[model samples]
Target chain A: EVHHQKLVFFAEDVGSNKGAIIGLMVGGVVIA
Target chain B: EVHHQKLVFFAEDVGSNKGAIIGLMVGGVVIA
Candidate 1:
């Protein structure tokens, strides 16, 4: 499985800014 | 823009790691 959601979660968790965090969170669910 | 914690600085300019620029500077400064 791609598990895009998990990848995005980890990505956002690793992000230092709000835009990246929000993007990762939304994209995670959307692309999942 | 929301500069959270001056975007989280080193608190002291003398102690700034950015000025040195050593090692693998990863997700932290990069995302911003």
Candidate 2:
């Protein structure tokens, strides 16, 4: 038997000062 | 002072079975 899955990665900066960034990645691959 | 930065996100699947997933996040923001 074989199966498939998905992976997601995300990052964010929340501050009440200066400089802010955010990143995200989605939809990966997996089998068995 | 305020500084700007870059953010990176990544995801991967590394397994020899069923349902394998990996996720990562790097870089952010800062203030001084």
Candidate 3:
């Protein structure tokens, strides 16, 4: 068995370039 | 004075409808 790391991106809209990051899902942790 | 944090997303093809997330720029941290 093996474990992998995953990162989730949260944003209002990724198509826009004037927006900022909302938060992050880092592995099993969340960073805001 | 103030500091800022940011997150960047990298994909093989973000233009595609389906794609896997690759790498990240979480503030001053980098995840691959």
Candidate 4:
């Protein structure tokens, strides 16, 4: 038997800054 | 002109624990 799951994530820059930022996803198998 | 870039990341459980972990990615546009 096989099971499927959906995951979502969100992030925000609470600090007062205006510049290019990057996000790093570390770990797990990505089957999107 | 058009440009493209790719980024990858990884993480490991350094502590003594066996459990299901979750990740959250907050911010930026995802064009995959």
Candidate number with greatest lDDT: 3
Instruction: For model 4, state the Cα shift of residue B16 in Å.
Output: 28
The sequence of per-residue lDDT tens digits that candidate 3 reaches over residues B1-32 is: 44435434543223223222333435443223
Each candidate's B-chain TM-score, in sequence, is: 0.19, 0.20, 0.21, 0.19
Pitting candidate 1 against candidate 4, the one with the higher DockQ is: 4
Native-to-model Cα distance after best TM-score fit, residue A20 in candidate 2, in Å: 19
> Candidate 1 clash total?
1
Q: Per-candidate TM vs. native? A: 0.15, 0.16, 0.18, 0.15
Q: Show the lowest summed lDDT stretch of 10 residues, model 4 chain A.
A: A13-22
Each model's total of backbone clashes: 1, 0, 0, 3
The candidate maximizing TM-score is 3
Q: Give the DockQ-based CAPRI class for model 4.
A: incorrect
TM-score of chain A of each: 0.11, 0.18, 0.20, 0.18
CAPRI-style quality class for the chain A–B interface of candidate 2? incorrect
Clashes of 3: 0
Q: Candidate 3 on A1-32: residue-level lDDT in tens?
A: 43434444532334423222433435432222
The runs of at least 3 residues in candidate 2 whose Cα sits more than 4 Å from the true structure, single-residue gaps closed, are A1-32, B11-32
Model 2: reference contacts kept, as a fraction: 0.06
Model 4: lDDT equals 0.32
All models, DockQ values? 0.03, 0.05, 0.05, 0.04
For B1-32, candidate 2 gives per-residue lDDT tens digits of 45434423332332222222233433422222
* Candidate 2 structure quality by residue, lDDT tens digits, A1-32: 44434423433342222222232424332232
Task: Give the Å error, residue B13, model 3.
Answer: 16
Alpha-carbon shift of residue A32 in model 4 (angstroms): 30
